[PDB]
Amino acid sequence: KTKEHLMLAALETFYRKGIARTSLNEIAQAAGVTRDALYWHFKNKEDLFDALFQRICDDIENCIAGGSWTVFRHTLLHFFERLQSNDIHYKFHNILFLKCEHTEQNAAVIAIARKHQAIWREKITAVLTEAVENQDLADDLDKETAVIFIKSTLDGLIWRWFSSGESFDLGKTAPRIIGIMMDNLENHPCLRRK
Amino acid sequence: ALKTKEHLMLAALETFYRKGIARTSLNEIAQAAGVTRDALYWHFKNKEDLFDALFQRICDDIENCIGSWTVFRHTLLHFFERLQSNDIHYKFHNILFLKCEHTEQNAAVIAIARKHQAIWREKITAVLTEAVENQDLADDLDKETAVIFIKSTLDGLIWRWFSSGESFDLGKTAPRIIGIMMDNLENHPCLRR
């Protein structure tokens, strides 16, 4: 896993300079290896970022591994918890929201982040579908809008926290926001596929 | 005078949109404006000045579009409507959320964005203040958490819309995100003290 030393060098350089302004060179340097050594494991700055994204998901699943709806709750609380206690999770999301501009110069990286978004949307859809089946959520729940509503809510909190310089207690705020979101998903008529 | 400042301002908005704020240079803006470096400097010394003025143009449009709780609802609906129909608003917020990295190289511009967040917090705290007094909201209301709630809700919808490459119908989506948000403010227990 000389890959991890490399992934961390990138994660560390992305955090400091932002993705667009970091080159494989500096990443190789920061990692103390050669360009060819790096290239052998990662052919791009985009693959490194891709690897980080994947590492982040792996962690989330390894942790998730009564009622799937109730476990979704903990998974969400557990996410904001480590978003603040885990360094790799803190830096990665900070980079994603605050240091990854949507310029043509970054299109490749943005395409990568785009497939991962798709991955989470699919995963949220599965949670919703299962919650319905187990009757934790109403049968006429508008799943399409629910997913958008869920991502919107969580992304909003993350953006708000990082963008304000962490000017508010995430440990106390997230639970509240999560409880309101899940209550809305269970009871609010606006989220019904009426 | 005001028309020339407006030409330079929109020229900056255009190049910020095209390649982000960090990469945009005063020369590039000047070239895009067709003016000279000195002429641009005459109205705006730096990028943070163009950006700050861009912020004001936006804050002026929301305000010069004017129960306090009902107006507030209308202000939010209007806001998302023009994020779709108004070119200045579409790009400014797109730049704010997707092309304004928080690096040491943009510290000055972020500083500006931060003073504007502070006022928005202010505007909203006052809206919440009349609401409780006019009984549109409970005395029980946790104003501090409420403001964060309001900002994170709106910011998520915006980021979500821009990030997804506008993959969903903002006109259909925003009225409901706002509707749910307002119901929460009024009735949810987790927003109380």
Counted by DSSP, the helix tally of chain A is 9
Q: Most extensive interface: pair and counts?
A: A-B, 42 and 41 residues
Instruction: Indicate the CATH topology of chain A.
Output: Tetracycline Repressor, domain 2
What is the molecular shape of chain A?
Answer: elongated
Number of strands of chain A: 0
CATH class category label of chain A: Mainly Alpha
Percentage of residues in helical conformation of chain A: over 70%
Secondary-structure class of chain A: mainly alpha
Q: What are the secondary-structure elements of chain A, in order, as H or E?
A: HHHHHHHHH
What distance separates the N and C termini of chain A?
51 Å
Written description of the protein model:
The structure is a homodimer. The first copy, chain A, has 194 residues and is mainly α. The first copy, chain A, has a single domain (1-194), classed as Orthogonal Bundle (Tetracycline Repressor, domain 2), CATH 1.10.357. Helices cover 76% and strands 0% of the residues of chain A. Chain A has nine helices and no strands. Chain A has helices at 2-17, 24-31, 35-41, 45-64, 68-85, 87-98, 107-133, 143-163, 170-187. In chain A, helix 1 crosses helix 4 (45-64), helix 4 (45-64) runs parallel beside helix 7 and helix 5 (68-85) packs across helix 6. The longest helix of chain A has 27 residues, at 107-133. The radius of gyration of chain A is 19 Å and the shape is elongated. Chain A starts with a helix and ends in a 7-residue tail after the last helix. Chains A and B meet through helix 8 and helix 9 of A and helix 8 and helix 9 of B. Chain B: GO terms for molecular function: DNA binding. Chain B: Residues 25-44 bind DNA. Chain B: This is MtrR.
